[PDB]
Amino acid sequence: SELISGGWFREENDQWPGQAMSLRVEKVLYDAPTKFQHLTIFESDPKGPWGTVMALDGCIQVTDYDEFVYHEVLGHTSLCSHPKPERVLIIGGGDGGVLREVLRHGTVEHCDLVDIDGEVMEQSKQHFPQISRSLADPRATVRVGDGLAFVRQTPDNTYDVVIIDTTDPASKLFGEAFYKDVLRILKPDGICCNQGESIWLDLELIEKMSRFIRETGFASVQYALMHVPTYPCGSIGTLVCSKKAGVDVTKPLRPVEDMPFAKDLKYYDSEMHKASFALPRFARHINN
Amino acid sequence: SGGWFREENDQWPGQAMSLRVEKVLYDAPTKFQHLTIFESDPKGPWGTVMALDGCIQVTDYDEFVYHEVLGHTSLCSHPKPERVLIIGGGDGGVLREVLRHGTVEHCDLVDIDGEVMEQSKQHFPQISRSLADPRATVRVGDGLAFVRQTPDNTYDVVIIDTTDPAGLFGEAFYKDVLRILKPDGICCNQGESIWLDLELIEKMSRFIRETGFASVQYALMHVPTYPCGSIGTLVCSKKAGVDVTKPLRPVEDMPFAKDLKYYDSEMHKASFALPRFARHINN
C-alpha cells in the first residue's frame, strides 16, 4: 500500500522522537502484514550498495550489504566463548543468518531453531537465499512455534549455547519465567547470547536487561558492541552471558583463527571479539 | 523544508537521514560553504545541530566522540607533545581536547571559514570556549599557505580536521606537514567511513605512507550522526617502528581522564581493530 517503485522507504520508529532514515525503493518484492508483524521486502537503489532490504514492523532487519555483521557477531562471539559447543538453540533467527554462522563450527553436532513467524522464513527463502540456505542443513531442526513453550518443555542441561535473536515478538510480559527456563536448559558451562539495544538510544534498557539476567542466576553478563550501518544510530549490541562463574567471555576461549572457515568471515575475528567489549566511558559501567 | 532537515546523498545516491527541526538558528551560505544551524526536536536528545554543505558536523549529543578521538588518540601516542597545530577545527572541539593536556605549551589553529567559528561561538559555547584560551593562537586563513611558510621541526602533533575545504593540493601539503613535524612527530588526519568509501581510505593511507610517514594506522569510532554510523581517523607516525595502537602516555595517569565521556586507553586499543573486510588498511 505504502511503498512504490521510485518512491522512498522511511524508517521512523518512536524509540527516537524526531528522527528518521530513508532508502530509495527500486522494486517492491513484498509489503503486507503477517500473522504476527508487518513484513516489507524490497530492492533498493541499484546505484546504492544495500541491495535487497527487509523491514519488520517498519524497522530494517536485513540488507544484503551489512547483513553479515549482526549474524557473525551473535554466531561466533558466543560459540568461540564456549569450550566445546555441541548442541545449540536459537530463539528467533527465522531468516537463518545466525544459523548459517553457528553451522560453520565443526563442534556443533545439532542446532535447534524456534521462530514464531513462518511467513518471514518463507520470504527469506525466496529473496535472501544466501542467508536462508542453512535452514535446510541436516544438523538444523527448524521449528515454527512459541519459544516460551519450547524452552519450558526442554529438559535441564540440554544446550551448550542459547542464542536469543529477538526483543520479544525491561523484562516485560514474559521475561522472568523465560530467562529462568533459559538458565536451566543450559549446561553448567553454558553460554547465553541475547540481542541488545543501542547504547545511544536506550542505554537505560541495556542496564536493566543486564542486571535482570545477572539476578536470574547467570554468573556474568557482558555487552559486545558492533558496527551496523543500517541500525538507527549505527551501533546495536549483544549480551553474552555465562552460567559458569569464572569464565571471561571478553577474550576468545576457542579463537576462530584455529578453524578453517576463519578467512570466509567478513567482519568477525579474534581481535574484533576483544575490541567489542571495550565500551565508551559513558557506557562503561555496563561491563564494570 | 516542512519541519525536517534532510542529509545529502552526494556520493552513493539512494540513502538519506532526517531530523525534525524545532527552531532554525542559521541557514545560509558563507564565504566557502553552506552553513546550517538549528535546534532539533526537544523530545529527541540531539539538541542543537550544525550541518556544513548538507552534512551534519556537530550535534550537542554526540559531539564529544569525534573531538576526544582526534584530540587524545594522537596526543596520547606522542612521548611529550609541547607544540600542536590544528588545520580546520573552527568549532574549537578538537582544540578543547588538546588543551586538556598539561604538556601542551602552545597550540596553533588555522581554519579558513570565519563565519563557522562565529556561529559556533554563539550556538555551541561548550565546544567553542577553547578558542579564547591563552595557549591557543586562532587564525582565519589558508592552511596550505600556513604550513608551507612554517619552518621545519616546529610541531609535535598536527591534527588535520578537514577533507579539504578552501576552494587538488595533497602532494605539496602532506610533504609540508611531514617537514614541519619534529622527528618523533605524530599526524592525525580525519578519515572516511569503512562502509561508504573504503577505497578512498586505502588510497589516502598509501599516499601518506608514500609521502614519507613511517607508519599509518586507521582508528575506528562510534559516531551515531554520521551516515553509516562510523567515521574514523588516520594516525600517522614519522618515526619508524612506532606502534600507535597501544597508548604511549595512558590518559588514566592524567587528571582529566574521568572527565572524558568516550575515550580511554581501552577504547584507544579497540579503535584500531577493524572488521575483516577493512583490515587491509592497517596491515
Are the beta carbons of A192 and A241 closer than 8 angstroms? yes
Q: Which residues pair with B220 in a beta bridge?
A: B232
Task: Answer yes or no: do A229 and B224 touch at CB < 8 A.
Answer: no
Binding-site residues of B for S-adenosyl-L-methionine, please? Answer: 33, 111, 142-143, 162, 190
Are the beta carbons of A282 and B261 closer than 8 angstroms? yes
Distance from CA of A234 to the nearest CA of B (A): 4
* CATH 3.40.50.150 residue window(s) in chain A: 66-288
Q: B283: exposed, middle or buried (C-beta count within 10 Å: 0-12, 13-18, 19+)? A: exposed
Q: Which helix (H) or strand (E) holds B23?
A: strand B15-29
Instruction: Write out the E strands in chain A.
Output: 8-11, 19-33, 38-44, 52-56, 59-63, 87-92, 110-115, 140-144, 159-165, 186-196, 220-225, 237-242
Chain A environment of B275 (Cβ under 8 Å):
69, 227, 266-268, 272
CATH of domain B62-283: 3.40.50.150
Rg for chain A, CA atoms, rounded:
18
| Cα distances (angstroms) measured from residue B258 to each of A153, B253, B263, B264 | 49, 10, 10, 9
Residues 6+ apart with CB under 8 A from B261: A280, A281, A282, B64, B68
Q: Cβ of B170: how many Cβ atoms within 10 Å?
A: 13
Query: How far is Cα B124 from Cα B118, in angstroms, rounded to an integer?
Result: 10
Query: How far is Cα A244 from Cα B150, in angstroms, rounded to an integer?
Result: 61
Query: How far is Cα B106 from Cα B221, in angstroms, rounded to an integer?
Result: 27
Are the beta carbons of B233 and B267 closer than 8 angstroms? no
Query: How far is Cα B81 from Cα B89, in angstroms, rounded to an integer?
Result: 18
Asked if B283 reaches chain A (Cβ–Cβ under 8 Å), the answer is: no
Phi, psi torsion values for B240, nearest 5 degrees:
-75, 155
Please count the residue pairs, one from chain A and one from chain B, whose beta carbons lie less than 8 angstroms apart.
125
Question: Among this protein's residues, is A181 annotated catalytic?
Answer: no
Q: Which amino acid is at A238?
A: T
Chain B environment of A228 (Cβ under 8 Å):
229
Q: Which helix (H) or strand (E) holds B184?
A: strand B181-191
Q: Which amino acid is at A224?
A: A
Catalytic site residues of B? 161
- Can you say how many angstroms the Cα of residue B48 is from the centroid of all Cα atoms in its chain? 19
Instruction: Look at residue B37 and give its three-state secondary structure.
Output: strand
- Can you say how many angstroms the Cα of residue A48 is from the centroid of all Cα atoms in its chain? 25
Q: B248: exposed, middle or buried (C-beta count within 10 Å: 0-12, 13-18, 19+)? A: middle
* CATH 2.30.140.10 residue window(s) in chain A: 1-65
Q: Which fold has domain A1-65?
A: Spermidine Synthase; Chain: A, domain 2 (2.30.140)
Asked if A33 reaches chain B (Cβ–Cβ under 8 Å), the answer is: no
Task: Answer yes or no: do B222 and A231 touch at CB < 8 A.
Answer: no
In which residue are the cell numbers 582529566 written? B256
Are the beta carbons of A24 and A8 closer than 8 angstroms? yes
DSSP secondary structure of B97-123: HHTT-TT--EEEEEES-HHHHHHHHHH
* CATH 2.30.140.10 residue window(s) in chain B: 1-61
**Approach to solving:** X-ray
Chain A environment of B46 (Cβ under 8 Å):
18-19
A175-185 and A203-216 helices, crossing angle to 10°:
50
Q: Which residues of A139-160 are buried (b: 16+ CB within 10 A; e: fewer)?
A: ebebebeebbebbeebeeebbb
Q: Which residues pair with A192 in a beta bridge?
A: A162, A241
In CATH, the architecture of B1-61 is: Roll (2.30)
| Cα distances (angstroms) measured from residue B2 to each of A9, A18, A76, B95 | 18, 13, 45, 36
- In terms of DSSP bridges, do strands B181-191 and B155-161 run parallel, antiparallel, or are they unpaired? parallel
Residues 6+ apart with CB under 8 A from B199: none
Cell of B43: 523530545
Phi, psi torsion values for B281, nearest 5 degrees:
-70, -40
Cell of B9: 546523498
* CATH 3.40.50.150 residue window(s) in chain B: 62-283
Instruction: Look at residue A41 and give its three-state secondary structure.
Output: strand
Q: Looking at domain A66-288, does it have CATH number 3.40.50.150? A: yes
Q: Which helix (H) or strand (E) holds A126?
A: helix A118-127
Distance from CA of B218 to the nearest CA of A (A): 14
